Amino acid sequence: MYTFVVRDENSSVYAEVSRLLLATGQWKRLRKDNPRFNLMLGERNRLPFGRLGHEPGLVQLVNYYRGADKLCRKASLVKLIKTSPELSESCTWFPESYVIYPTNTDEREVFLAAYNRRREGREGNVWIAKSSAGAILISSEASELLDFIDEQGQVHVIQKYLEKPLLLEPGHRKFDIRSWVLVDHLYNIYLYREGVLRTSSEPYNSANFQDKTCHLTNHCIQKEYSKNYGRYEEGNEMFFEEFNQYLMDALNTTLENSILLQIKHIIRSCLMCIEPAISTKHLHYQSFQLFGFDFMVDEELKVWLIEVNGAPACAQKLYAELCQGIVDVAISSVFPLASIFIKL
Amino acid sequence: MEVIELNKCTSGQSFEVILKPPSDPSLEEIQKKLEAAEERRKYQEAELLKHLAE
Amino acid sequence: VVXXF
Amino acid sequence: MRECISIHVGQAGVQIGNACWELYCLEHGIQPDGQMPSDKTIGGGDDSFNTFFSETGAGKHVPRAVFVDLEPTVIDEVRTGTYRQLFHPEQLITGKEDAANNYARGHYTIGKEIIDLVLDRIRKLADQCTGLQGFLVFHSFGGGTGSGFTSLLMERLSVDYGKKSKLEFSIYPAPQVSTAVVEPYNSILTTHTTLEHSDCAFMVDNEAIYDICRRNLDIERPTYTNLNRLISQIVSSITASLRFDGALNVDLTEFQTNLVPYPRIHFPLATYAPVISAEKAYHEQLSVAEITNACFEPANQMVKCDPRHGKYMACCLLYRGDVVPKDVNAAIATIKTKRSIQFVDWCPTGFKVGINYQPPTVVPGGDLAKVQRAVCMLSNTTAIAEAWARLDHKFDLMYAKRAFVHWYVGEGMEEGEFSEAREDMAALEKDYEEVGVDS
Amino acid sequence: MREIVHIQAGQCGNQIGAKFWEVISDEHGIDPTGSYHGDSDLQLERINVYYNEATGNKYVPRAILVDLEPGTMDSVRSGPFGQIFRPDNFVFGQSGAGNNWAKGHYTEGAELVDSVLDVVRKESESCDCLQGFQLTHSLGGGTGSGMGTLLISKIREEYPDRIMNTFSVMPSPKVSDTVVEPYNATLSVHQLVENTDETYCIDNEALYDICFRTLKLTTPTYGDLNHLVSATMSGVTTCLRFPGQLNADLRKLAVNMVPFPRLHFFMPGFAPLTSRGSQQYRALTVPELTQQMFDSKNMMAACDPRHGRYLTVAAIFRGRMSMKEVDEQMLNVQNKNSSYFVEWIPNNVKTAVCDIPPRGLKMSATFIGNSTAIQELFKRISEQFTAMFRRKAFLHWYTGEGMDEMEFTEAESNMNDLVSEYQQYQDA
Ligand SMILES: Nc1nc2c(ncn2[C@@H]2O[C@H](COP(=O)(O)OP(=O)(O)OP(=O)(O)O)[C@@H](O)[C@H]2O)c(=O)[nH]1
Ligand SMILES: Nc1ncnc2c1ncn2[C@@H]1O[C@H](COP(=O)(O)OP(=O)(O)CP(=O)(O)O)[C@@H](O)[C@H]1O
Ligand SMILES: Nc1nc2c(ncn2[C@@H]2O[C@H](COP(=O)(O)OP(=O)(O)O)[C@@H](O)[C@H]2O)c(=O)[nH]1
Ligand SMILES: [Ca+2]
Ligand SMILES: [Mg+2]
Ligand SMILES: [Mg+2]
Ligand SMILES: [Mg+2]
DSSP string, E119-147: HHHHHHHS-SSEEEEEEEEESSSSIIIII
Q: Could you tell me if D394 and D245 lie in one domain?
A: no
Q: Which amino acid does the sequence have at E246?
A: L
D305 interfaces chain A, CB cutoff of 8 Å: yes
Q: Could you tell me if D83 and D4 lie in one domain?
A: yes
d(CA D301, CA E122): 55
| Residue E68 per-residue DSSP state | S
Q: Could you tell me if D315 and D423 lie in one domain?
A: no
Domain total in chain D: 3
Grouping H, G, I as helix, E, B as strand and the rest as coil, residue E2 is: coil
Which one, of E8, E268, E35, lies nearest residue E148 by Cα?
E8
d(CA D414, CA D416): 5
Q: Could you tell me if D283 and D175 lie in one domain?
A: no
Q: Could you tell me if D167 and D87 lie in one domain?
A: yes
CB atoms within 10 A of CB E56: 8
Which one, of D271, D315, D303, lies nearest residue D389 by Cα?
D303
Contact partners, residue D272, CB within 8 Å, separation at least 6:
D233, D234, D237, D295, D300, D302, D374, D375, D376, D377
Q: Do domains E1-259 and E374-428 have the same CATH topology?
A: no
Alpha-carbon torsion (A293, A298, A300, A305), positive or negative: negative
- The CA distances from residue E155 to E38, E63, E120, E194, E303, in Å, are 35, 15, 9, 13, 31
From the CA of E97, the nearest ligand is: 3
With b meaning 16 or more CB within 10 Å and e meaning fewer, what string describes E60-72? bbbbbbbbbbeeb
For C3, the closest of E15, E75, E208 (CB atoms) is E208
| Residue E59 per-residue DSSP state | E
The atom number, within ligand 2, closest to the CA of A296 reads 4
Q: What is the CATH number of domain A1-63?
A: 3.40.50.11480
Residues in B touching E157 (Cβ below 8 Å) = 49, 52
With b meaning 16 or more CB within 10 Å and e meaning fewer, what string describes A29-45? bbeeeebbbbbbbbbee
Are the beta carbons of B17 and B1 closer than 8 angstroms? yes
Residues in C touching E175 (Cβ below 8 Å) = 1, 3
Q: Residue E342: exposed, middle, or buried by beta-carbon count in 10 A (0-12, 13-18, 19+)?
A: buried
Residues in E touching A33 (Cβ below 8 Å) = 343
Q: Could you tell me if D82 and D109 lie in one domain?
A: yes
Q: Which amino acid does the sequence have at D74?
A: V
d(CA D32, CA D28): 12
Q: Which amino acid does the sequence have at D345?
A: D
Are the beta carbons of D368 and D273 closer than 8 angstroms? no
Are the beta carbons of D436 and D382 closer than 8 angstroms? yes
Q: Does domain A96-163 have CATH number 3.30.1490.20?
A: yes
Which one, of E202, E78, E190, E187, lies nearest residue E137 by Cα?
E202
- The CA distances from residue E321 to A55, D110, D176, D387, E362, in Å, are 24, 38, 18, 34, 9
Q: Could you tell me if D158 and D249 lie in one domain?
A: yes
Are the beta carbons of E340 and E369 closer than 8 angstroms? no
The helix (run of H) or strand (run of E) holding residue D258 is helix D252-259
- The CA distances from residue E397 to A220, A316, E102, E181, E412, in Å, are 83, 79, 8, 12, 18
CB atoms within 10 A of CB D40: 8
Beta strands in E80-121 (DSSP E): 90-92
d(CA E26, CA E359): 7
Are the beta carbons of D367 and D278 closer than 8 angstroms? yes
Are the beta carbons of D413 and D104 closer than 8 angstroms? yes
Q: What is the CATH number of domain E260-373?
A: 3.30.1330.20
d(CA D24, CA D235): 10
Are the beta carbons of D271 and D301 closer than 8 angstroms? yes
**Peptide bond before residue A170 is cis, with ω within 30 degrees of 0:** yes
Neighbours of chain A (3+ CB pairs under 8 A): D, E
Instruction: Look at ligand 1, atom 5, and give the residue with the nearest C-alpha.
Output: D12
Instruction: Look at ligand 2, atom 25, and give the residue with the nearest C-alpha.
Output: A134
Q: Does domain E374-428 have CATH number 1.10.287.600?
A: yes
A46: left (phi over 0), alpha (psi -120 to 50) or beta: left
Grouping H, G, I as helix, E, B as strand and the rest as coil, residue E64 is: strand
Q: Could you tell me if D259 and D350 lie in one domain?
A: no
φ, ψ for residue D301 (rounded to 5)? -75, 150
With b meaning 16 or more CB within 10 Å and e meaning fewer, what string describes D410-420? bbbbeeebbee
For D350, the closest of B8, B16, B25 (CB atoms) is B16
**Rounded-to-5 percentages of helix, strand, coil across chain C:** 0, 0, 100
- The CA distances from residue E394 to E101, E180, E413, in Å, are 12, 7, 19
Q: What is the CA radius of gyration of chain E?
A: 20
Give me the residues near ligand 4 (ion), CB cutoff below 5 Å: D 39, 41, 45
Contact partners, residue A146, CB within 8 Å, separation at least 6:
none
Q: Tell which residues of chain B come right before a gap with C–N over 2.5 A.
A: 23
Question: Which ranges of D8-142 would DSSP assign to H, the alpha helix?
Answer: 10-27, 72-79, 103-104, 115-126
d(CA A9, CA A140): 41
Q: Which amino acid does the sequence have at A256?
A: E
Grouping H, G, I as helix, E, B as strand and the rest as coil, residue E299 is: strand
What number of residues does chain E have? 428
| Residue E167 per-residue DSSP state | E
* Domain residue ranges of chain E, discontinuous segments joined by +: 1-259, 260-373, 374-428
Contact partners, residue A261, CB within 8 Å, separation at least 6:
none
With b meaning 16 or more CB within 10 Å and e meaning fewer, what string describes E285-320? ebebbbbbbbebebbbbbbebeebbbbbbbbbbbbe
Are the beta carbons of E247 and E350 closer than 8 angstroms? yes
d(CA D423, CA D392): 10
State in Å, rounded, how far the first CA of chain B is from the last one: 81
d(CA E145, CA E166): 12
| Residue E113 per-residue DSSP state | H
Q: Could you tell me if D87 and D143 lie in one domain?
A: yes
- The CA distances from residue E13 to D140, D214, E29, E185, in Å, are 42, 48, 24, 14
Q: Could you tell me if D141 and D251 lie in one domain?
A: yes
Are the beta carbons of E47 and E28 closer than 8 angstroms? yes
- Check A35 against E334: CB less than 8 A apart: no
Contact partners, residue D326, CB within 8 Å, separation at least 6:
none
Which one, of D228, D241, D321, D312, lies nearest residue D274 by Cα?
D321
Grouping H, G, I as helix, E, B as strand and the rest as coil, residue E351 is: strand
Are the beta carbons of D210 and D174 closer than 8 angstroms? yes
- Check D414 against B40: CB less than 8 A apart: yes
Are the beta carbons of D382 and D401 closer than 8 angstroms? no
- The CA distances from residue A51 to A34, A246, D137, D385, in Å, are 12, 50, 28, 11
d(CA A142, CA D24): 70
φ, ψ for residue A273 (rounded to 5)? -70, -45
**Peptide bond before residue A109 is cis, with ω within 30 degrees of 0:** yes
Per-residue 3-state assignment (H helix, E strand, C coil) for chain A: CEEEEECCCCCHHHHHHHHHHHHHCCEEECCCCCCCCCEEECCCCCCCHHHCCCCCCCCCEECCCCCCHHHHCHHHHHHHHHHCCCCCCCCCCCCCEEEECCCCCCCCCHHHHHHHCCCCCCCCCCECCCCCCCCCCCECCCHHHHHHHHHCCCCEEEEECCCCECCECCCCEEEEEEEEEEECCCCCEEEECCCEEEEEEEECCCCCCCCCCCCCCCHHHHHHCCCCCCCCCHHHEEEHHHHHHHHHHHHCCCHHHHHHHHHHHHHHHHHHHHHHHHCCCCCCCEECEEEEEEEEEECCCCEEEEEEECCCCCCHHHHHHHHHHHHHHHHCCCCCCCCCEEEC
Contact partners, residue A297, CB within 8 Å, separation at least 6:
A165, A166, A177, A258, A259, A303, A304
Q: Residue A9: exposed, middle, or buried by beta-carbon count in 10 A (0-12, 13-18, 19+)?
A: exposed
Q: Which amino acid does the sequence have at A302?
A: K
φ, ψ for residue D172 (rounded to 5)? -80, 140
Q: Which domain holds residue D390?
A: 384-439
d(CA D261, CA D263): 6
- Check D403 against E344: CB less than 8 A apart: yes
d(CA D67, CA D77): 12
Grouping H, G, I as helix, E, B as strand and the rest as coil, residue E166 is: strand
Which one, of E286, E267, E266, E349, lies nearest residue E315 by Cα?
E349
Q: DSSP labels for D375-416?
A: EEEEEEEGGGHHHHHHHHHHHHHHHTTTTTHHHHHTTT--HH
CB atoms within 10 A of CB E239: 24
d(CA D357, CA E161): 56
C-alpha D43 to ligand 4 mean position (Å): 7
d(CA A53, CA A59): 7
Q: Which residues pair with E202 in a beta bridge?
A: E169
The helix (run of H) or strand (run of E) holding residue D430 is helix D415-435
φ, ψ for residue E412 (rounded to 5)? -60, -50
Contact partners, residue D291, CB within 8 Å, separation at least 6:
D273, D274, D373, D374, D375
Structure resolution, Å: 2.5
Q: Could you tell me if D363 and D395 lie in one domain?
A: no
D108 interfaces chain B, CB cutoff of 8 Å: yes
Q: What is the CATH number of domain E1-259?
A: 3.40.50.1440
Q: DSSP labels for D211-255?
A: HHHHHTT--SS--HHHHHHHHHHHHHHHHHHHHS--SSS-SHHHH
Are the beta carbons of D376 and D318 closer than 8 angstroms? yes
Alpha-carbon torsion (A318, A320, A326, A328), positive or negative: negative
Q: What is the CATH number of domain A64-95+164-344?
A: 3.30.470.20
Say if strands B14-18 and D350-356 run parallel, antiparallel, or are unpaired: antiparallel
**Peptide bond before residue E272 is cis, with ω within 30 degrees of 0:** yes
Q: Could you tell me if D405 and D281 lie in one domain?
A: no
* Domain residue ranges of chain A, discontinuous segments joined by +: 1-63, 64-95+164-344, 96-163
**Peptide bond before residue D274 is cis, with ω within 30 degrees of 0:** yes
Long-range CB contacts (within 8 A, 24+) of A216-225: A216/A136, A217/A174, A217/A175, A217/A176, A220/A134, A222/A198
With b meaning 16 or more CB within 10 Å and e meaning fewer, what string describes E243-253? ebebbbbbbbb
Say if strands E364-371 and A303-309 run parallel, antiparallel, or are unpaired: unpaired
Are the beta carbons of A175 and A238 closer than 8 angstroms? yes
Are the beta carbons of E373 and E339 closer than 8 angstroms? no
- Method in brief: X-ray
B29 interfaces chain D, CB cutoff of 8 Å: no
Grouping H, G, I as helix, E, B as strand and the rest as coil, residue D308 is: helix
